[PDB]
Design an enzyme around this catalytic site. Structure first.
Site, PDB file in Angstrom:
ATOM      1  N   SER A   1       0.786  -1.223   0.000  1.00 48.34           N
ATOM      2  CA  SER A   1       0.000   0.000   0.000  1.00 48.34           C
ATOM      3  C   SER A   1       0.822   1.279   0.000  1.00 48.34           C
ATOM      4  O   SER A   1       1.515   1.551  -0.993  1.00 48.34           O
ATOM      5  CB  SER A   1      -1.057  -0.027   1.109  1.00 48.34           C
ATOM      6  OG  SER A   1      -2.022  -0.940   0.668  1.00 48.34           O
TER       7      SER A   1
ATOM      8  N   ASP B   1     -10.153  -6.453  -2.425  1.00 47.70           N
ATOM      9  CA  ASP B   1      -9.637  -5.145  -1.986  1.00 47.70           C
ATOM     10  C   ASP B   1     -10.406  -3.960  -2.622  1.00 47.70           C
ATOM     11  O   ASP B   1     -10.382  -3.773  -3.855  1.00 47.70           O
ATOM     12  CB  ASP B   1      -8.142  -5.058  -2.298  1.00 47.70           C
ATOM     13  CG  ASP B   1      -7.460  -3.884  -1.597  1.00 47.70           C
ATOM     14  OD1 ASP B   1      -8.174  -2.940  -1.167  1.00 47.70           O
ATOM     15  OD2 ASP B   1      -6.209  -3.922  -1.481  1.00 47.70           O
TER      16      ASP B   1
ATOM     17  N   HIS C   1      -8.144  -5.928   1.420  1.00 47.92           N
ATOM     18  CA  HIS C   1      -6.972  -5.059   1.464  1.00 47.92           C
ATOM     19  C   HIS C   1      -5.809  -5.590   2.366  1.00 47.92           C
ATOM     20  O   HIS C   1      -4.616  -5.356   2.087  1.00 47.92           O
ATOM     21  CB  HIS C   1      -7.403  -3.676   1.900  1.00 47.92           C
ATOM     22  CG  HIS C   1      -6.326  -2.658   1.775  1.00 47.92           C
ATOM     23  ND1 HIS C   1      -5.677  -2.410   0.579  1.00 47.92           N
ATOM     24  CD2 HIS C   1      -5.787  -1.811   2.685  1.00 47.92           C
ATOM     25  CE1 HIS C   1      -4.780  -1.461   0.759  1.00 47.92           C
ATOM     26  NE2 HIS C   1      -4.813  -1.090   2.030  1.00 47.92           N
TER      27      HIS C   1
END
Lengths: 274, 275
Positions: B101, B225, B253
């Site tokens: 991320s 996600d 996620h």
């Protein structure tokens, strides 16, 4: 105009707005939590009218004129729905419910099977699994602590909880849905809070084994709020229940995929006697 | 047992130290946590598998976490410099990199400005730009912090669960029970560091810049996600000359906590056959 709903534990009478269009086979729509009767008009009613149905929509206890209503239960709202059908002298009526409105439909069919000829239950369940129980307790905690969410964060939650991944990946659709939120403000009222509890306290699935009437249960693939698999459970319990899944539909699949959901409702309703 | 390196100097000409961890004697791998993640987050699942595979693992507290939770007005470029400093102080250039991320964005930007520091990378749950929904989500998150309002603990936990896990996970009463309870042990503290980490994201389309990264890269997409959807990761992999795309099914996620064996197996397969 208006009909009289059930008297509440505190001995007060209540009137509830309803709307009645067209002539033909009667269909009563029950909206989910926070849904006014108007929710069925942009997508369902015009299709049902074109198919020859008479459509009754109405404002559930705790909405609009009764948004300050409280201390009510599922049973109170089921009784409300029974009053509409009897007052209007349309028993047995076809019923379309979604989520809280589908629960009401179910629980109505348990106590008054003769008010209902056939039903479509969308985005429904018969119990709360561990996730949905936790979510429900978390919403109650939000309201009860007084804190109001800021408006963009509130639109973020509305987006993420109600729409398919496919919708979220489409910048144009996303834009439109956000705009669409301004047009459907959901006020945080004592009525909204009370509808939160009009949900399965227990496993209601055994009771559904006795519902005889034909029922289509529609599940939405992408629904995290009332996941498809709890929809399926309801269908299995219903002896003459069938199940259908809409792909790439969030919790609000009936708005998001209105053509697919209408086609399937109409199809089902044409396959059963009035 | 208390390791710190010195990162980028901030615009007030202050030295910032950042805590790091370093275990194993094999091929070095630097892990870069996502927004709000301490280095310790790599430890319940990634570190032990990498150690058992003979890699040396480096983890750290990103600027704005832990001892620097009160730090603000830094940028992606600041954090990219922190990471550069880490690789340099330890003299492990060019290193293997694993980011998720925000960490994967950092790694991507590191590669742009200092390709020599990185031999290969795994980028999990990433993007090179924000689409309309992700842009809007970010605005909404900033609005939440900036308004001062505190979400009640249960409601916040609800959101965590909804933002982070797959549908397969939410339907599993026991697993869900375990995740609800795991939030007590990893609370996500609202800090100025966290609010600044929100802006260490793709302001612009970064995909054109990535066509110049030569290094081998595996990008991992997580099927369910919604925070960084799979198709945004695919984009990253397409822009990369030597990038390849893998997608883990039934992964929110937080796929790398939710499916640790699938993700680990993928990364170790990848790293075994890189140059």
């Amino acid at each position: 105009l208006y009909f009289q709903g059930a008297m509440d534990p505190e001995f007060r009478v209540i009137n509830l707005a309803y709307d009645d269009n067209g002539t033909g086979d009667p269909v009563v729509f029950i909206a989910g939590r926070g849904g006014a009767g108007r929710t069925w008009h942009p997508h369902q009613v015009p299709a049902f009218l074109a198919a020859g149905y008479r459509c009754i929509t109405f404002d559930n206890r705790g909405i609009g004129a009764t948004e300050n209503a409280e201390g009510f239960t599922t049973q109170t709202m089921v009784a409300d729905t029974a009053a509409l059908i009897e007052t209007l002298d349309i028993a047995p009526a076809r019923v379309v419910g979604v989520s809280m409105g589908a629960f009401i439909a179910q629980e109505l069919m348990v106590v008054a099977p003769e008010l209902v000829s056939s039903a479509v239950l969308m985005a429904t369940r018969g119990r709360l699994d561990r996730a949905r129980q936790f979510f429900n307790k978390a919403e109650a905690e939000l309201y009860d602590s007084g804190v109001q969410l800021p408006p963009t964060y509130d639109a973020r939650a509305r987006l993420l909880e109600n729409f398919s991944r496919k919708t979220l990946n489409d910048d144009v659709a996303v834009g439109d849905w956000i705009a669409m939120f301004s047009m459907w403000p959901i006020k945080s009222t004592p009525g909204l809070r009370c509808q939160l509890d009009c949900a399965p306290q227990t496993n209601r699935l055994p009771a559904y084994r006795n519902i005889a009437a034909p029922v289509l249960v529609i599940g939405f693939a992408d629904d995290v709020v009332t996941p498809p698999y709890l929809g399926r459970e309801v269908a299995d319990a219903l002896p003459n229940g069938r199940y259908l899944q809409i792909p790439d539909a969030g919790h609000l699949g009936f708005f998001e995929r209105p053509e697919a959901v209408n086609t399937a409702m109409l199809k089902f309703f044409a396959s059963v006697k009035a």
